[PDB]
């Protein structure tokens, strides 16, 4: 028993982290096989940053402008290329610690582990979610660009996030590992801001199932709701719409606990309308939305 | 910016986890050099468990009763010994992945990362604290005994916890790596329960400093308190006494933010007496006590 915010074991990703240096600018890169992947803004000066043309900036670089350090070993760059917002540096040595891996672009609502890194060196691991507004609420300082987010599927690391920037509200924006931003953001200094976020309803429902599995049952009731009447309440409280696909995904947890999805929806409706009244669920005094249905199943059973 | 519950990168500990089997009983062990460390209750049957004499139970075992598996490789046990509540199995192979390491027995209030394991295989990583009552609020299922808790100091892993049991309330009890329980607990099935816990005051104050560093400042006030008058309030709300040593430890954070420790104590006093009034701090609607002063410094700067 017990329920914690739990990251994946980070070892397999630790063995891929490198430092990439271009000039005075230094950040982290991901070394898989003979390629190192990093944010393309490593090639920029402060003057460039207002509106860079990256195609011009990279045209003016040679392989010898890129210093890659793996540990204490300097890796020699033998080719360079840009794919979207990521730079790919080909190196002369394949990483002997390369795990089995995939690159995946995730949907909003999906969770992942972040290995926060500075100068090629892992500092900490944490879980977060891709928010509906395509930011993440991470924990990142100066120097952390190029840190990655991942899930593990047995022995396969599925990389899903590379960190690029911090927005004015203190949340974070970045790309998939093929260099496409999540959201409307661009890799320049401009006026960009996060849009209005929503709560991830299917995840709240999953975590209420986690709570039941762990013995918190106070919020349950004898009532049910229709999906439409639930969705009407959800809209009012700035929650995402619940779909039949979500209802179907919550199937396993419904079966384990004995509580129908739309019966759990009536609990959530009551919690939204009334509050908790000073009580807690799983240690929380607010409704938590960064555990997926899969995360609950993973951890609880 | 941002502030998350953050574990240490777990790689160095992942390379030490093994499965230990004794009969039908299987659990996790920690392989460092040529020794594997695990909970001594691996030698018990269900019948024994009411009140085992472990000295008799181990006297009846040979080396060949212990199967250690590292990955797919079976490691051959060449000696066995008991130290307190841990079994030490000497194996014929030194672990080539052994990190630099220490064993440390921590004080209540200190935090650590847990690598939760099943059958020798890491499943997830999370942070927790040693509570004042000498339990931890972990996340552990059947099969997780022998999972360890640790801190990292540069490249040195300081192991501080080995998991042994779950108490009736769903919290967890275990030992240091020399096999001494934290708390009054014993490794048998008996009527034992967690005592009344308290909130770790110095850690709450650290996290309020984290909040200020990250821009949440709403809870601050123009007031101050004496240490004695603060301690009087702390007692009433079931908080641990704040010492001058704690005040001194909070020095760095006081200096960075400009807020005196006893001025921050007046904020906490006001929060205890009045509540948050529907506001949040760092995403939380309750006061968080599982970040130490060191953890804040680590993460924020
Ligand atoms: O995020 C911005 N700038 C970053 C700042 N930075 C950091 O490593 C960093 C600093 C401070 C907190 N952090 C948290 N994560 C990373 C950082 C170096 C890269 C730079 C950048 C360059 C080209 C394109 C995109 C971002 C920025 C500017 C205006 C709004 N945002
Ligand atoms: O924790 C108890 N028994 C454990 C149960 N167990 C597990 O791996 C485990 C099961 C279920 C949830 N978990 C969470 N962490 C581990 C587990 C095998 C070892 C056993 C044990 C044997 C000798 C001495 C101490 C504990 C127990 C009994 C009465 C109160 N507590």
Author numbering:
A (entry chain A), B (entry chain A): 1 to 301
Task: Show the paper's wording.
The main protease (Mpro) is essential for viral replication. The primary function is to cleave two large viral polypeptides into functional nonstructural proteins. , Although Mpro is a highly conserved protease among various coronaviruses, there are no human proteases with a similar cleavage specificity. Therefore, Mpro is an attractive target for antiviral drug development for COVID-19 treatment. Here, we report the discovery of highly potent noncovalent inhibitors of the severe acute respiratory syndrome coronavirus 2 (SARS-CoV-2) main protease (Mpro) with pan-coronavirus (pan-CoV) Mpro inhibition through computer-aided drug design.
Structure-guided scaffold morphing provided a novel trisubstituted piperidine core. In order to evaluate if it was possible to introduce P3 substituents on the piperidine core that could cause induced-fit effects in the S3 pocket, we applied FEP calculations, as implemented in the FEP+ package (see Experimental Section for details). In FEP+ calculations, compound 11 with the P3 alkyl moiety and compound 12 with the P3 aromatic moiety were predicted to improve the SARS-CoV-2 Mpro inhibition relative to compound 10 by inducing an induced-fit in the Gln189 side chain along with the formation of hydrogen bonds with the backbone of Glu166 (FEP+ ΔΔG = −2.9 kcal/mol (10 → 11), −3.6 kcal/mol (10 → 12), Figure C–E). As expected, both compounds exhibited over 10-fold improvement in the SARS-CoV-2 Mpro inhibition compared to compound 10 as well as moderate MERS Mpro inhibition (11 MERS Mpro IC50 = 4200 nM, 12 MERS Mpro IC50 = 4500 nM). Comparing the binding mode of compound 12 in the crystal structure with the one in the FEP+ calculation, a representative conformation of the side chain of Gln189 in the FEP+ calculation did not correspond to the one in the crystal structure. This is probably because the side chain of Gln189 has large fluctuations and various conformations, as indicated from B-factors in the crystal structure and the FEP+ simulation. Although the P3 acetamide moiety of compound 10 had a binding mode similar to that of compounds 11 and 12, the SARS-CoV-2 Mpro inhibition of compound 10 was weaker. It is likely that potency is significantly boosted by the addition of P3 substitutes that form a hydrogen bond with the backbone carbonyl oxygen of Glu166.
